């Protein structure tokens, strides 16, 4: 089959985590084991490709040639923690896979019969149709979602396949099972790497190879069943009743450079630096665009507990704030009634929104693990992204609250006013989930992008022109309001509404006011909050929050992009 | 020593998870081990007093006598996850657990001696002055951090010593330090009683006793080195390499009604039901009040990152709010900024107030363990929280920003009038504190009792009385203003601030108003808001927040007083 | 400016009761707010509600859906409903204006009675 | 709504004597407080506005002070054009409200 063999390698990342480390893995079971810092899962990523060749410094060649650039197209890599989705069922995942990695030249049915090939292998018929493992609906057991995860690599039909700790976090039988699947696996010519964490001997008999690393240095490299050999004649006694394994490992425990001495001057390197010696995109954009936007659709349908939740929060919002507000009156109260829910809706458009920030941070290492493997561009990945997750919810609370509370209210009566209305509290949601976005994008936790969102939104809300009257502060300071989105939105519901309007009963104050302190009409009203009265005085809101959305939008995919996935 | 004796025990919870269990456990090593869900846990809880008496139905006798009152209080026992402070020092746990535990007539000399004997037993001389892990700070080893948590149950000298998974989390060789230990130990006529999880050969040599057991039923019970034997003589073979652990669990794994009746079937249980039937505060209150805050507030020192942030945010909030509004002037746009101001500062005080949720939370365990153990009453417990955490972090970013906006801004430049509004501010937070640990006392996570605190506030902030105008409200509705805490402190804020002010200059009202909807001073402002002239109407405010201070407070103790502490 | 009421003198129980006050002088639609205000046997005065010179219309909350006022701009006139009308409602009814730089009512009608008999 | 109470339902005086009526609101009215006067067979008529301005058209003998709750109209040397009935009313707030009235009488 395909044999994988590495020479001299070095990695310093500048600290040296991995030093002169050489050896070659044929077809069959190969294990590397080690200490949990030693070095196993550091050499399994360099033997992947899946870290920068920066550090690298070494020789790795597969059947005697250098990688070649698409090799992590070619070959399958499973992650230790699962990343399959949830929502989704087995046949749905493989679907997924084998629609953006699969040659589109290949039609439905050929794709669907390598799907019908690969379930029957790894024997997941009996679930092919079941959601696979939900947290708020019951999943297959874990063994079957580790099966999924294989499967998903071996839809392409990889020659080589590694594993990242193929059996933590199951239970024993479940870990017998996998690697049997895995044997059984491995005698068809298919050449299996994977690192494992202190098995069992019933584990360990089935090795076809054994490398073990500590501290970054190789402690043995060879045939497994010879590991007790070579620790024998070092001059270690086996007790019996012992797990080789724990042997090993309390060997290594107990001096490491004596065992990496002990070990270049053994036989087994010898003839591994003879051997050495001797030797020496797929879819279109618009595809993966649908077929992310559909994944992400699915997801969002079938875990609806959030989406749920800010509906009937928005909905009780809506009844509540139509009821205390009920029937608004053109008096000495009317002004402060209307400036006092307007203010409301617009602010509450912008903290609601700060639940933005888990649009990307929880698929973080689905997305760099789906990226590496050649799945998708990052264009169509943030662009379906965008266009099944913030589009819908972020518009459907806008058009909830203005067709619960404008009639409830008794807010202007055209149909214009109306839809002026809802596009306004549209732009005001896009414009903060975009800065969430911006500003939470290509990182691992959300509790500082939280924090500095909330922040920013407290000082946006005071700029608003409620609280402190933008036309008396100070010119040094003034120039802060051109940075707040709410100011936008606020501004604009207010000429929406309060244009036309009179409010000092009895007495007519559009001709001229009888006394200079009255503030008898909505112009007034306007003029004295630093509102322009004409047309575009409304409208500059609007290219305003147009302009913030495409510079944010814009942010986050240029966070995306030059973000290390590695 | 102490001879721990269990005969029929049947527990059920009305499922029954523990069958017919039996057995007898002597000074020396004694292990119980089976499956995650088999009922070694459970057995462990029952036999340490940990469980409520409901599902009990067996005898447990100690030295062939009753378990009396103070069991708990004379035997100790070691959590899984350990609970030692991590802010303080090895030296500093251990005197607070000798403080708390031991007789108050030992002087402060014996229990310094005592002290040392239990470090210097344990081998933690090296560490006495380290901090036990911190998360900001680097902290001592976990083996250090498992021995201190052994050393704390030490210090009143127990007979026996439970101790839940104490090698879980922790590395083979730290794990064998462990049990190399309680070996030490145990010779001295200390019984030990454990459970353990996949257990090695080099661990499991060390018994003295076993008892396994699965799906609640007892499959074995006798010597340890005897099991292997046992299931020999059932007819399963073991294999060479082969951990004798993992042997029992794998013919567990493969029934179990056959293994328990060929349990019953054996001379191990005939030797044991035989012997069965042959045989069949400390402290003062203030005492505890004054430790339990000294520990808390050393712990709010050590751990600075949370306060120190809130601190930073209110000063910066502080310096900006001073800035944007500096010199409010008395003109038409004077109403507006001071109640923009005003309202801000109150609505704030209750936001930033749904942090004190993480009270109680955070430290449910330890609290539920030390209160089981006698350490301390609820009551003191209660207070000493209260005294030390929530009393000086809500009174200091009242007294900040009073001190930083006031002279600022140019409110009432009286010293009544500010320190009015400093007492108004912290009586404020108080109240809004005190809701959020009603809210969240005797819970274990955050999530839904944030929502719930976030929702009320923000109900409470629109009926303040800057946004909807109290007086304009439907009768079947009005009544709810009662309930919001921003509504007293606005109240009281903004009658402090506008009695005896003029805002129409050149015009003067105070006489009479020329024209009837100027609105040219602070008492028509104040009167159209629906706010009382007189001095009570200041008063009452603070009234109704001490009220709602004590209610909550008291709501909070009796939470943590009929919580379930089991 | 001036102002007259006008309707009929007599209602039935459970009938309708309308009345009329035409104003010269002044336009309706120019500056005041138009009032109508009732005043028991037994002198006392209640205020029932009033138009506003742009149409909006306030109403006592103690007479509940039971009255309305409209306005006529071609003629100069606004009109008074008050329905379901019961005996308690015996009084003399008067239109004044309220002009509201001021607050209050300073032209009224003559009055024109009103009983509700069988 | 607003419940103003006037103290005297009737009062008994003889000519040249000085009459004082007082009006109670139940909340604050801040000068919004006006004073009527009613013959036999007319509509009411306007004789005081914003609790102190007399009306063009009065004389002088007329004059009303007060402030937050208690208002009074004051009459000195009272005359026989000066017998009728006096109503406070209050135009605070938007349910305008009236006092009962006070009958002044000749003995």
């Known amino acids: 089959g395909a044999v994988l063999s590495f020479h001299n390698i070095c990695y310093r990342v500048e600290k040296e985590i991995l030093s002169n480390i050489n050896g070659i893995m044929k077809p069959g079971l190969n294990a590397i084991l080690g200490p949990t810092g030693g070095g196993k899962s550091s050499l399994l990523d360099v033997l992947a490709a899946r870290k920068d060749p920066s550090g690298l410094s070494g020789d790795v060649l597969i059947n005697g040639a250098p990688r070649p650039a698409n090799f992590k197209c070619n070959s399958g890599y499973v992650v230790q923690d699962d990343v399959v989705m949830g929502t989704l069922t087995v046949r749905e995942n493989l679907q997924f896979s084998a629609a953006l990695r699969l040659a589109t030249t290949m039609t439905n049915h050929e794709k669907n019969e390598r799907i019908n090939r690969v379930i029957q292998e790894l024997g997941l018929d009996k679930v092919a149709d079941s959601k696979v493992g939900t947290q708020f609906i019951r999943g297959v057991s874990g063994g079957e979602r580790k099966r999924t995860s294989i499967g998903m690599e071996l839809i392409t039909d990889p020659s080589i396949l590694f594993l990242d700790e193929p059996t933590t976090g199951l239970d024993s039988s479940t870990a017998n099972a996998v690697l049997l699947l895995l044997k059984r696996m491995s005698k068809q010519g298919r050449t299996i790497i994977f690192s494992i964490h202190q098995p069992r001997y019933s584990i360990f008999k089935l090795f076809d190879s054994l490398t073990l690393l500590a501290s970054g240095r190789l402690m043995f490299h060879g045939p497994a069943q010879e590991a007790l050999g070579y620790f024998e004649s070092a001059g270690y006694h086996c007790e019996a009743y012992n797990n080789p394994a724990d042997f090993f490992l309390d060997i290594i425990n107990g001096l490491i450079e004596k065992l990496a001495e002990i070990y270049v001057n053994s036989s087994f390197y010898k003839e591994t630096k003879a051997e050495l010696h001797q030797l020496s995109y797929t879819t279109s954009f618009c595809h993966q665009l649908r077929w992310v936007s559909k994944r992400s659709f699915k997801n969002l349908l079938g875990n609806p507990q959030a989406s749920i939740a800010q509906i009937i929060v928005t909905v009780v919002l809506g009844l509540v704030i139509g009821a205390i507000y009920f029937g608004l009156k053109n008096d000495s109260t009317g002004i402060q009634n209307r400036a006092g829910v307007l203010f409301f809706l617009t602010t509450n458009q912008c903290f609601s929104s700060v639940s933005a920030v888990e649009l990307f941070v929880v698929e973080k290492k689905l997305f760099i693990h789906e990226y590496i493997s050649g799945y998708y561009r990052v264009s169509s990945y943030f662009l379906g992204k965008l266009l099944s997750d913030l589009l819908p919810m972020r518009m459907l609370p806008s058009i909830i609250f203005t067709c619960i509370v404008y009639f409830m209210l008794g807010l202007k009566p055209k149909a214009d006013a109306f839809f002026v209305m809802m596009f306004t509290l549209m732009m005001v949601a896009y414009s903060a989930s975009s800065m969430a976005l911006a500003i939470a994008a290509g990182q691992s936790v959300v509790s500082v992008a939280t924090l500095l969102m909330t922040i920013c939104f407290v000082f946006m809300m005071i700029f608003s022109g409620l609280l402190v009257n933008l036309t008396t502060i100070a010119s040094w300071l003034s120039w802060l309001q051109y940075f707040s989105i709410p100011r936008y939105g606020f501004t604009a519901l207010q000429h929406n509404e309060f244009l036309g309007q009179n409010f000092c009963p009895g007495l007519n104050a559009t001709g001229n006011n009888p006394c200079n302190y009255a503030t008898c009409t909505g112009e007034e009203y306007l003029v004295k909050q630093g509102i322009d009265l004409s047309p575009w005085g409304l409208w500059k809101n609007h290219v305003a929050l147009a302009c913030m959305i495409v510079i944010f939008l814009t942010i986050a995919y240029l966070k995306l992009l030059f973000l290390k996935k590695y | 020593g102490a001879v721990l004796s269990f005969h029929n025990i049947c527990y059920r919870v009305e499922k029954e998870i523990l069958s017919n269990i039996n057995g007898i456990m002597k000074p020396g090593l004694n292990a119980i081990l089976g499956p995650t869900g088999g009922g070694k846990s459970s057995l462990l809880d029952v036999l340490a007093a940990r469980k409520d008496p409901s599902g009990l139905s067996g005898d447990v006798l100690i030295n062939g006598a009753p378990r009396p009152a103070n069991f708990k209080c004379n035997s100790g026992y070691v959590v899984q996850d350990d609970v030692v402070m991590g802010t303080l020092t090895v030296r500093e746990n251990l005197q607070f657990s000798a403080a708390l535990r031991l007789a108050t007539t030992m002087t402060n000399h014996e229990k310094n001696e005592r002290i040392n004997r239990v470090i210097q037993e344990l081998g933690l001389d090296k560490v006495a002055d380290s901090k036990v892990g911190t998360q900001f700070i680097r902290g001592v080893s976990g083996g250090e951090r498992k021995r201190t948590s052994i050393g704390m149950e030490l210090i009143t000298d127990p007979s026996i010593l439970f101790l839940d998974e104490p090698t879980t989390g922790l590395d083979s060789s730290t794990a064998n330090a462990v049990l190399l230990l309680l070996k030490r130990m145990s010779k001295q006529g200390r019984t030990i009683i454990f459970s353990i999880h996949q257990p090695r050969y080099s661990i499991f040599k060390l018994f003295d006793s076993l008892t396994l057991l699965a799906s609640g039923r007892l499959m074995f019970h006798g010597p340890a080195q005897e099991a292997l034997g046992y299931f020999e003589s059932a007819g399963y073979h073991c294999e060479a390499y082969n951990n004798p652990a993992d042997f029992f669990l794998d013919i567990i794994n493969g029934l179990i009604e056959k293994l328990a009746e060929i349990y019953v079937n054996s001379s191990f249980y005939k030797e044991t039901k035989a012997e069965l039937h042959q045989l069949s505060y400390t402290t003062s209150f203030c005492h505890q009040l004054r430790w339990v805050s000294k520990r808390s507030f050393k712990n709010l020192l050590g751990n600075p990152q949370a306060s120190i942030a809130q601190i930073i945010v209110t000063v910066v909030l502080g310096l900006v709010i001073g800035a944007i509004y500096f010199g409010l002037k008395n003109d038409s746009t004077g109403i507006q900024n001071r109640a923009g101001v005003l309202f801000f500062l109150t609505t704030n005080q209750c936001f930033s107030s749904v942090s004190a949720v993480e009270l109680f939370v955070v430290e449910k365990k330890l609290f539920i363990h030390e209160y089981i153990s006698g350490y301390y009453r609820v009551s003191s417990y209660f207070l000493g929280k209260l005294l030390s955490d929530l009393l000086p972090m809500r009174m200091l970013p009242s007294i900040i920003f009073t001190c930083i906006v006031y002279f600022m801004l140019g409110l009432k430049p009286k010293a009544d009038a500010f320190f009015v509004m400093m007492f108004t501010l912290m009586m404020v937070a108080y109240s809004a504190s005190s809701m959020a640990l009603a809210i969240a006392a005797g819970q274990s996570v955050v999530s839904v009792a944030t929502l719930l605190m976030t929702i009320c506030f923000v109900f409470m902030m629109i009926f303040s009385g800057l946004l909807v105008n109290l007086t304009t409200i439907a009768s079947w509705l009005s009544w709810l203003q009662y309930f919001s805490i921003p509504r007293y402190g606005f109240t009281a804020l903004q009658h402090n601030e506008f009695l005896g002010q003029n805002f129409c200059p050149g015009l003067n009202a105070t006489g009479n108003n020329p024209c009837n909807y100027a609105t040219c001073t602070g008492e028509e402002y104040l009167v159209k808001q629906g706010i009382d002239l007189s001095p009570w109407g200041l008063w009452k405010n603070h009234v109704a927040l001490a009220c709602m201070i004590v209610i909550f407070l008291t709501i909070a103790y009796l939470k943590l007083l009929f919580l379930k502490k089991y | 400016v001036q102002l007259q009421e006008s309707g009929p003198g007599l209602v039935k129980p459970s009938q309708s009761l309308s009345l009329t006050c035409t104003v010269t002088?002044?336009?309706?639609?120019?500056?005041?707010?138009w009032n109508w205000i009732r005043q028991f046997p037994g002198k006392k005065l209640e205020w029932m509600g009033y138009?506003?010179?742009?149409?909006?219309?306030t109403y006592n909350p103690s007479l509940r859906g039971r009255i309305s006022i409209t306005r006529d701009t071609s003629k100069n006139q606004f009109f008074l409903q008050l329905r379901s009308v019961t005996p308690e409602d015996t009084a003399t009814y008067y239109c004044?204006?309220?002009?509201?730089?001021?607050?209050?009512?300073?032209?009224w009608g003559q009055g024109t009675s009103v009983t509700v008999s069988s | 709504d607003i419940v103003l109470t006037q103290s005297p339902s009737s009062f008994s005086v003889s000519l040249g004597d000085r009459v004082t009526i007082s009006c109670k609101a139940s909340?604050?009215?801040?000068?919004?407080l006006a004073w009527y006067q009613q013959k036999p067979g007319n509509a009411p008529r306007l004789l005081i506005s914003?609790?102190?301005s007399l009306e063009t058209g009065f004389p002088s003998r007329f004059s009303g002070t007060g402030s937050g709750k208690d208002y009074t109209l004051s009459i000195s040397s009272l005359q026989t054009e000066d017998v009728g009935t006096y109503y406070c009313?209050?135009?605070?707030?938007?349910?305008?409200?009236f006092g009962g009235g006070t009958k002044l009488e000749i003995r």
């Open positions: 914003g609790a102190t």
């Open positions: 138009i506003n010179f742009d149409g909006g219309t």
């Open positions: 002088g002044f336009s309706i639609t120019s500056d005041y707010a």
């Open positions: 004044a204006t309220f002009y509201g730089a001021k607050g209050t009512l300073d032209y």
């Open positions: 009313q209050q135009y605070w707030s938007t349910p305008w409200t």
């Open positions: 909340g604050y009215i801040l000068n919004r």
